[PDB]
C-alpha cells in the first residue's frame, strides 16, 4: 500500500476517474480492504462507481465451495433477495453503502464488512440486522471454522452496536429513543428492538439504555417515578386517580390510567386470583353429581374467555411464525396444558358415568392452574433473575432423583426379601419396597414394622423359623426373625447415605450452579423483560372475565414512532455524528497505547540508525577529499 | 509523592523516551544538512 | 439386511440393549427373592 500511497500522493500526477473505478473494482475482488479504504477516502465518487454488471461481477466473485454461492445458485443476475427473504423471514429481511455491507456480511469478508458499516447510515440497525444475518448463516454452515467466524464477526457486530447506542444515549435521550424505536426500511421495517430480539442480542437489552425506555413503556402515560403504593391506591379507588398522587403525561386521564401496560398486568393479576379463588369454591363445596350450579357456569363462562384471550394472543402474538413465537414461550404451555385439562375435566364430568374422573382431572388442573401464579415474581427487580436461576437446576434435581431411584430400589428390595412378610400382595410389595423408604427420608421411620425386638413373639407362619407380629396395617401379617440385626445394620446405612450424602450433595450441585449460572440469568431476565412489555402492551384494558367485551369488538373490526423525511434525514445525520465521534475515539485510545508507543519507537530508533550509518559515510568522505 | 509516583511510572517513561527519539531525529536531520552543506561549500 | 446390521451394531445400540437388559435381570431377580425363593427345589 505504501506504493499505492506515494503514486497517489504526488501533485504533478493526477489520476483519471477510470484508473481509480478499475482499481476499486481489482481491490473490491481481491479483498484488500486498505487499498478499497484509500481508494474512496481519495475523492472517489461510490454512487456513480457501482453498476449492476459490476454487482453481479462481485457476487459471482463468491467462492465455488461456499454457502453463499450455494443458496444463490439454488435460488435460481443475482437474485440475493429471494437468499435474503428465505434466509431471515419476511418480517426483517431486506451512496450505495448498504449493498456493499450486505455482499462483505454475505461472503464474510470481516474488514471489508466493517469498512462498510463505518461508511454506512443506519449504523445500530445495521449493525443488529449484521448479527441477526450473521447468526443465521451460522445456523447453516457445515463447516465448524465458517461458523465460528460467522459467530465471532456478529459478536463483534453486537458490540458496535451496543456501544454506538450508549455513545447516543448519553448524548439526548429522546433521540435515541426515537432511533431506537423507529423502522428501518433496509431491513423489512423492523424496529431495533424486533431486531435484537431475532438475533437474540441480550447484551444490547441489558444496558441501561434500552433498560430505561422499557421501563417508560411499562408505566404508559404515567411517570415512571410513580411508586407502587401510590399505583395500588388508585386502582382500588378509581375516583382517586384524578388527584395529585399519580403523575402524568410521561376522560383522557381515565384511559391514560386504565390503559398503561403496568395497570393492565394487575388487572390480570387481580382477576387470576379471583379466578383460582372461584375455582377453589367451586372445586371444594360446589362440584356434586348434580347438574352444574350458578358458580360452576360461571367458572366456565371465566374459562372461555380465557380460552379466547390465548387464541388472541396466539394469532396476534406469517402465521406460522407467530404460531411457533407463541408456543415458544413455557408461560403459553403452562396455559395451553390447563386449559386441556379443563375441558377434559369438564367433558368427562358432564358423562353421567365419569363424575369422579373429571373430579380428579380437574383436581389435577387447579394446580397447573395455580402453577402460572410465578410469572408475578419475575416482573419484580430482584427476584426476576432468580427465576431463571432456578429453571436451571433441573438437570441436579434428575441427578438426584436418578440416584435416588437406584438406592430405593436396592435398599427396599433387599429389606422386603430379609423380612418375607406374609401378605406379599403386589401393591403391598411395591409399597413396603418404595413409598416407606421415601418417607424415611422426612422422619418417617417406622421401626415397630422393621425392628424385631419391638415386636410380639408368635408362631403364626406354618414355615419352619421364628416369627413376630408387627402392629403395622400395611406392614405384613409376620416377619421373619433371622437376620434382624441386618435389617438394623441396612436402616443405619440408608438413613447415612439417602439422608446426609445425597441432600448434602444436592445442596451442593445447587449452590454451585447457582453461582455459575447467575451472571448469564440476569442478562437472560433483562432480555424477557421485553417481551413480557410487548405482551401487556397490545391486551386489552380488560380483566379475563369481561374481556369477552374487548375480544367482541376485536371481532366487530374483524412500539412505533412515525418520522418525516427531514426528521428522519437529521435523526441519521447526528446518528453519523456520534459514530464518526466513537471511531475516533477508539482509534485514539488504540494509537495511545504502550505497545503502539515502543513500536513506533523502535520504527524511529531504525530511522536514527539509518541516518547515522549515512553521515558515517558521509563524513569518512569528506575526510578523504580534505586530506 | 503521588505526582513523583505517576512520573516514575513505566507509561511516562516510553512517552519521554519517544519524545526524547524524536528530538534525536531532528537533531540528525539538521547534522545531515549541514553537513552536506559543509562538503558542497569545501569542495 | 446391511442396515440391520448396521443398527444393531452401534456401539450406542449396544449400550442400550444391555442396559434394557439388566433392568430386565434386575426385574426377574427381585421377582425370584421376594416370591420365588422358597426351601423347595428351584
Ligand atoms: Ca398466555
Same mark, same amino acid.
Given at each position: 500500500v505504501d506504493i499505492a500511497q506515494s503514486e497517489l500522493f504526488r501533485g504533478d500526477i493526477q489520476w483519471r476517474s477510470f484508473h481509480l473505478e478499475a482499481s476499486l473494482m481489482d481491490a473490491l475482488l481481491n479483498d484488500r480492504p486498505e487499498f478499497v479504504r484509500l481508494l474512496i477516502s481519495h475523492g472517489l465518487s461510490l454512487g456513480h462507481f457501482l453498476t449492476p454488471m459490476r454487482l453481479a461481477q462481485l457476487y459471482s466473485a463468491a467462492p465455488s465451495n461456499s454457502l453463499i454461492r450455494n443458496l444463490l445458485d439454488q435460488?435460481? /443476475?443475482?437474485?440475493?433477495?429471494?437468499?435474503?427473504?428465505?434466509?431471515?423471514?419476511?418480517?426483517?429481511?431486506?451512496?450505495?453503502?448498504?449493498?456493499?455491507?450486505?455482499?462483505?456480511?454475505?461472503?464474510?469478508? =470481516?474488514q471489508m464488512a466493517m469498512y462498510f458499516w463505518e461508511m454506512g447510515s443506519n449504523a445500530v440497525s445495521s449493525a443488529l440486522g449484521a448479527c441477526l444475518l450473521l447468526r443465521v448463516m451460522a445456523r447453516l454452515e457445515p463447516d465448524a471454522e465458517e461458523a465460528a467466524r460467522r459467530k465471532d464477526l456478529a459478536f463483534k457486530f453486537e458490540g458496535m452496536g451496543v456501544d454506538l447506542f450508549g455513545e447516543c444515549y448519553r448524548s439526548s435521550e429522546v433521540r435515541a429513543a426515537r432511533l431506537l424505536l423507529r423502522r428501518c426500511p433496509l431491513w423489512?421495517?423492523?424496529?431495533?428492538? $424486533?431486531? =435484537? +430480539?431475532?438475533?437474540?442480542?441480550?447484551?444490547?437489552?441489558?444496558?441501561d439504555g434500552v433498560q430505561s425506555l422499557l421501563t417508560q413503556k411499562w408505566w404508559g402515560d404515567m411517570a415512571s417515578t410513580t411508586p407502587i403504593w401510590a399505583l395500588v391506591l388508585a386502582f382500588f379507588c378509581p375516583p382517586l386517580i384524578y388527584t395529585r398522587l399519580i403523575?402524568?403525561?410521561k376522560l383522557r386521564r381515565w384511559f391514560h390510567f386504565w390503559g398503561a401496560p403496568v395497570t393492565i398486568f394487575?388487572?390480570?393479576?387481580?382477576?387470576?386470583?379471583?379466578?383460582?379463588?372461584?375455582?377453589?369454591?367451586?372445586?371444594?363445596?360446589?362440584? $356434586?353429581?348434580? /347438574?352444574?350450579? !350458578?358458580?360452576?357456569?360461571?367458572? %366456565?363462562?371465566?374459562?372461555?374467555?380465557?380460552?379466547?384471550?390465548?387464541?388472541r394472543q396466539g394469532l396476534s402474538g406469517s402465521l406460522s411464525q407467530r404460531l411457533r413465537?407463541?408456543?415458544?414461550? !413455557?408461560?403459553?404451555?403452562?396455559?395451553?396444558? =390447563?386449559?386441556?385439562?379443563?375441558?377434559?375435566?369438564?367433558?368427562?364430568?358432564?358423562?353421567?358415568?365419569?363424575?369422579?374422573?373429571?373430579?380428579?382431572?380437574?383436581?389435577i388442573d387447579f394446580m397447573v392452574f395455580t402453577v402460572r401464579l410465578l410469572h408475578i415474581f419475575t416482573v419484580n427487580k430482584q427476584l426476576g433473575p432468580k427465576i431463571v436461576i432456578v429453571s436451571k437446576m433441573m438437570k441436579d434435581v434428575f441427578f438426584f432423583l436418578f440416584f435416588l431411584g437406584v438406592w430405593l430400589v436396592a435398599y427396599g428390595v433387599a429389606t422386603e426379601g430379609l423380612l418375607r412378610p406374609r401378605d406379599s400382595d403386589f401393591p403391598?410389595?411395591?409399597?413396603?419396597?418404595?413409598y416407606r423408604p421415601?418417607?424415611?427420608?422426612?422422619? $418417617?421411620?417406622? $421401626?415397630?414394622? +422393621?425392628?424385631?425386638a419391638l415386636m410380639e413373639h408368635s408362631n403364626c407362619s406354618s414355615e419352619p423359623g421364628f416369627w413376630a407380629h408387627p402392629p403395622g396395617a400395611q406392614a405384613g401379617t409376620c416377619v421373619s426373625q433371622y437376620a434382624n440385626w441386618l435389617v438394623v445394620l441396612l436402616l443405619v446405612i440408608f438413613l447415612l447415605v439417602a439422608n446426609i450424602l445425597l441432600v448434602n450433595l444436592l445442596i451442593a450441585m445447587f449452590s454451585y450452579t447457582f453461582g455459575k449460572v447467575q451472571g448469564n440469568s440476569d442478562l437472560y431476565w433483562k432480555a424477557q423483560r421485553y417481551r413480557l412489555i410487548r405482551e401487556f402492551h397490545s391486551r386489552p384494558a380488560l380483566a379475563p372475565p369481561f374481556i369477552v367485551i374487548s375480544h367482541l369488538r376485536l371481532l366487530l373490526r374483524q412500539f412505533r414512532v412515525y418520522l418525516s423525511k427531514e426528521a428522519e434525514r437529521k435523526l441519521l445525520t447526528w446518528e453519523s455524528v456520534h459514530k464518526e465521534n466513537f471511531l475516533?475515539?477508539?482509534?485514539?485510545?488504540?494509537?495511545? !497505547?504502550?505497545?503502539?508507543?515502543?513500536?513506533?519507537?523502535?520504527?524511529?530508533?531504525?530511522?536514527?540508525?539509518?541516518?547515522?550509518?549515512?553521515?558515517?559515510? %558521509?563524513?569518512?568522505?569528506?575526510?578523504?577529499?580534505?586530506?
Open positions: 435460488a435460481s /443476475p443475482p437474485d440475493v433477495g429471494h437468499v435474503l427473504r428465505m434466509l431471515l423471514g419476511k418480517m426483517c429481511a431486506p451512496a450505495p453503502w448498504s449493498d456493499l455491507l450486505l455482499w462483505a456480511l454475505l461472503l464474510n469478508r =470481516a423489512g421495517d423492523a424496529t431495533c428492538l $424486533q431486531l =435484537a +430480539m431475532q438475533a437474540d442480542a441480550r447484551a444490547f437489552f441489558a444496558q403523575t402524568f403525561r394487575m388487572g390480570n393479576v387481580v382477576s387470576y386470583l379471583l379466578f383460582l379463588l372461584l375455582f377453589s369454591r367451586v372445586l371444594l363445596v360446589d362440584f $356434586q353429581p348434580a /347438574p352444574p350450579g !350458578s358458580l360452576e357456569l360461571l367458572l %366456565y363462562f371465566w374459562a372461555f374467555t380465557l380460552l379466547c384471550e390465548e387464541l413465537l407463541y408456543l415458544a414461550d !413455557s408461560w403459553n404451555q403452562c396455559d395451553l396444558v =390447563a386449559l386441556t385439562c379443563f375441558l377434559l375435566g369438564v367433558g368427562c364430568r358432564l358423562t353421567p358415568g365419569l363424575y369422579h374422573l373429571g373430579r380428579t382431572v380437574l383436581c403391598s410389595i411395591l409399597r413396603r419396597v418404595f421415601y418417607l424415611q427420608i422426612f422422619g $418417617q421411620i417406622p $421401626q415397630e414394622d +422393621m425392628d424385631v475516533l475515539a477508539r482509534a485514539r485510545d488504540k494509537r495511545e !497505547s504502550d505497545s503502539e508507543r515502543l513500536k513506533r519507537t523502535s520504527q524511529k530508533v531504525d530511522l536514527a540508525l539509518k541516518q547515522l550509518g549515512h553521515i558515517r559515510e %558521509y563524513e569518512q568522505r569528506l575526510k578523504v577529499l580534505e586530506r
